[PDB]
Structures are given as C-alpha cells and as structure tokens.
Amino acid sequence: GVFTFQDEYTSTIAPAKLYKALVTDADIIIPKAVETIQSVEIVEGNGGPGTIKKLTFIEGGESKYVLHKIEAIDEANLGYNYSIVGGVGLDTIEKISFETKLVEGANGGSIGKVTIKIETKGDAQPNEEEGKAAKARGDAFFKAIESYLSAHPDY
Numbered sequence: 001g002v003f004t005f006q007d008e009y010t011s012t013i014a015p016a017k018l019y020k021a022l023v024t025d026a027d028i029i030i031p032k033a034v035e036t037i038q039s040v041e042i043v044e045g046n047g048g049p050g051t052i053k054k055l056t057f058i059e060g061g062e063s064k065y066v067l068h069k070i071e072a073i074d075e076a077n078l079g080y081n082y083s084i085v086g087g088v089g090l091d092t093i094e095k096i097s098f099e100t101k102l103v104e105g106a107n108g109g110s111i112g113k114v115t116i117k118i119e120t121k122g123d124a125q126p127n128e129e130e131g132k133a134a135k136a137r138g139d140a141f142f143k144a145i146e147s148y149l150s151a152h153p154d155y
C-alpha cells in the first residue's frame with residue numbers, strides 16, 4: 001500500500017535562516033538544539049543526493065540510531081527530501097520518505113511543510129501509535145530548533 005501524511009509548522013523566523021539551521025548546518029545545530037538527539041554524522045557521501053546520515057538518539061532510555069539517505073537538496077527553493085534507510089530494530093513498512101519545504105509565512109516568518117510517504121507490504125496499514133509518536137517528535141523537533149535559534153541568533 002501507499003499512504004501519505006502532511007504536517008505544517010509556523011515560525012516567526014525567516015525561512016532561509018530556519019533552512020540553514022535544519023539542513024545546511026544540521027550536523028552541528030540539530031544535536032545542540034534537540035535534547036533527544038546526540039549526534040548527526042555523515043556515513044558516506046559529500047552532502048549531496050545519495051549521502052547517508054546517521055542520527056543517534058535516546059528513546060526509552062536506550063541509545064539507538066536511524067539512517068537517512070538524502071534524495072534532493074535545493075537551497076535555492078528551500079527544499080530537502082530524504083528517506084529512512086536503516087536503523088535499530090524492525091517491519092511491515094517497506095519505505096518511508098519525506099519531502100520538506102520552507103516558505104514565506106507571517107509577516108516575515110515561515111511555514112515549514114512536510115509530506116510523508118509510507119509504502120507498506122500488501123494491504124498492511126501504517127501503525128497509528130508509531131505515527132502519533134513520530135508526529136509528536138516532529139513537532140518537538142521543530143520547536144527545539146526555533147527555541148535554540150531564538151536564544152542564539154548570530155551563530
């Protein structure tokens with residue numbers, strides 16, 4: 001099966017600055033800003049499409065990681081696409097991909113848009129509890145970056 005989900009975030013912060021924190025300087029900023037993420041490292045690649053990143057985090061008190069493959073990175077248009085290609089545990093989920101953009105919000109602020117595509121085996125459905133947890137993580141993520149940027153404008 002194929003399933004899509006959308007989310008939206010608003011910030012007072014300007015889109016190019018948010019994008020620099022979220023994407024360009026993600027390897028430095030994300031482990032600083034996000035209290036449940038310890039490190040963000042390049043496993044392979046030069047930063048462009050194909051690059052594999054390893055994000056190490058703590059969940060339920062245990063150290064885990066997830067691998068992201070960069071699929072598209074377009075700073076001109078504040079776009080960033082990636083998919084999840086590995087990590088700890090397992091199972092019904094063949095693939096989960098993300099399309100993200102930042103656009104001009106209010107007045108000079110932003111809106112962050114994320115489309116999530118989930119491919120499953122057969123007529124398996126995406127697990128609702130796991131989706132709720134992921135959504136909550138997304139919200140907390142975007143909030144933590146905003147907070148950190150507010151406290152550190154000229155980094």
Ligand SMILES: COc1ccc2[nH]cc(CCNC(C)=O)c2c1
Pocket residue numbers: 009022023080100101102112113114138139141142
């Ligand atoms: C949570 O919401 C958003 C919204 C717009 C976005 N643009 C770029 C990203 C970051 C995507 N990187 C990771 C490691 O998740 C982003 C996230």
Ligand SMILES: C/C(=C\CNc1ncnc2[nH]cnc12)CO
Pocket residue numbers: 036037055057058059066137138141
């Ligand atoms: C891009 C994001 C997180 C990276 N992945 C995770 N970050 C933190 N906890 C997790 N539990 C499962 N996956 C994760 C949003 O937190």
Ligand code: NA
Pocket residue numbers: 030031032033034035036037038
């Ligand atoms: Na951290």
